[PDB]
Homo-oligomer: A and B are copies of this chain.
Amino acid sequence: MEKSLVDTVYALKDEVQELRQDNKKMKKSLEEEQRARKDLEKLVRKVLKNMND
């Protein structure tokens, strides 16, 4: 328990812990955006191919 800086290791273990939790929320959001984007991207081809044709 003398080697390394010791406390920094657990403090680090701690943030990386937080970091990973985040990637999950962002990965979550990213995917939620992608659904909204496409939902909109559909809503547009309506007033795209239709219009006057």
Contacts and interface: CB of A to CB of B under 8 A. Distances in A.
Interface of A: 1-6, 8-13, 15-16, 18-20, 22-23, 26-27, 29-30, 33-34, 36-37, 40-41, 43-48, 50-51
Contacts of A10: 8
Contact of A6 (B5, B40, B48): B5
A29 B31 CA distance: 9
Contacts of A1: 4-6
A37 B10 CA distance: 40
A4 B4 contact: no
Contacts of A19: 16, 19-20, 23
B23 A23 contact: yes
